[PDB]
Amino acid sequence: MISSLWIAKTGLDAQQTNMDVIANNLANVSTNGFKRQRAVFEDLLYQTIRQPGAQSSEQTTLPSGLQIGTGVRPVATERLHSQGNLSQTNNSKDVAIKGQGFFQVMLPDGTSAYTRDGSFQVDQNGQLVTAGGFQVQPAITIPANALSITIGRDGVVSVTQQGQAAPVQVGQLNLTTFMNDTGLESIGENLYIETQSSGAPNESTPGLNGAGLLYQGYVETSNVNVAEELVNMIQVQRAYEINSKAVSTTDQMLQKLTQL
Amino acid sequence: SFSQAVSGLNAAATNLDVIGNNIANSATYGFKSGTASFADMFAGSKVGLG
Amino acid sequence: VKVAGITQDFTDGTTTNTGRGLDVAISQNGFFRLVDSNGSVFYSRNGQFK
């Protein structure tokens, strides 16, 4: 009902969003290939009681005006597409991507999503699918009676059968990049889809045009550091408590005003 | 006073991280041990930025 | 540190004279060619034959 109360409400909402972001980052500290998110704010408008630099007299100008802020608005919550660390999972069908790029995947309706995960499995029909049932767009299939599947540093993937004393090539794991990886909007089950903010995807073999490289038998851990999350929790808790105390002070002031 | 302390906290972590790297890459053949170095930063005078 | 796979050493051994007649040793490079029941081809240096 009053300007200070509304400003404090906006501050409380901003701190609540910050705490929610911190909690979400801390929750999936062990998800493979997870990219953390950071919240960015920006202050709202200002009511100008007296125009700054106004012409007070024939020659004198106000060195500074009178402006009252209206609060703080959370402008965005952006993913930080940094480089996650790698671990030794020692699986023939586990791949990690070093650098930048995404593995394409086909949604059941028909569109294409993009992922950073590497836990690749095989469906009942022998097609290379990811955890969740989605299958890679280039449609790589693994034939039966397969001894070992070897994925090179580049996109070539080969399989070995019982005989023939030589590997046979199956397909190419081309990966796609975007002009602005931050603009991709996330969806459930660890996927990303193209939007207007990011550019049109460009597909390439690994190691060319800035794309990364594939490492077989590895997996990429989330880019979340537990050390600074706790201190961020401390700071956000203190800020929230301060805003609540400001609300209390405003309420007490108003009550003592209306006690008349 | 979090700004001064948090920066110092990160600096200690980086120093500890490099030590772990130098202690894990032992017995590697073509390896040279690495160490980190720091440097203070003051905006003007009497004010510390960590 | 990542492990770059094990590496084998193919230095010649020592041809101990154990007698008998079904045992052969190689003093230079060379692998015996072997086949299994299923038809696959294996390579080895074992001198035990019967």
From Swiss-Prot, chain A:
The keyword Membrane does not apply. InterPro entries: Flag_bb_rod_N (IPR001444), Flagellar_basal_body_rod_CS (IPR019776), Flagellar_FlgE/F/G (IPR020013), Flg_bb/hook_C_dom (IPR010930), FlgE/F/G-like (IPR037925), FlgG_G_neg (IPR012834), LlgE_F_G-like_D1 (IPR053967). PROSITE patterns: FLAGELLA_BB_ROD. Keywords: Bacterial flagellum. GO terms for cellular component: bacterial-type flagellum; bacterial-type flagellum basal body, distal rod. It is found in: Bacterial flagellum basal body. GO terms for biological process: bacterial-type flagellum-dependent swarming motility. It holds the Pfam family LlgE_F_G_D1. The basal body constitutes a major portion of the flagellar organelle and consists of four rings (L,P,S, and M) mounted on a central rod. The rod consists of about 26 subunits of FlgG in the distal portion, and FlgB, FlgC and FlgF are thought to build up the proximal portion of the rod with about 6 subunits each. PANTHER family: FLAGELLAR BASAL-BODY ROD PROTEIN FLGG, FLAGELLAR PROTEIN. Belongs to the flagella basal body rod proteins family. This is Flagellar basal-body rod protein FlgG. The gene is flgG.
Curated annotation (Swiss-Prot), chain B:
It is found in: Bacterial flagellum basal body. This is Flagellar hook protein FlgE. The chain holds residues 2 to 51 of 403 of the full protein. Belongs to the flagella basal body rod proteins family. It comes from the Bacteria. It comes from Salmonella typhimurium (strain LT2 / SGSC1412 / ATCC 700720). The lineage of its organism: Bacteria, Pseudomonadati, Pseudomonadota, Gammaproteobacteria, Enterobacterales.
UniProtKB/Swiss-Prot annotation, chain C:
It is found in: Bacterial flagellum basal body. It comes from the Bacteria. Disulfide bonds: none annotated. Belongs to the flagella basal body rod proteins family. This is Flagellar hook protein FlgE. It comes from Salmonella typhimurium (strain LT2 / SGSC1412 / ATCC 700720). The lineage of its organism: Bacteria, Pseudomonadati, Pseudomonadota, Gammaproteobacteria, Enterobacterales. The gene is flgE. The chain holds residues 52 to 101 of 403 of the full protein.
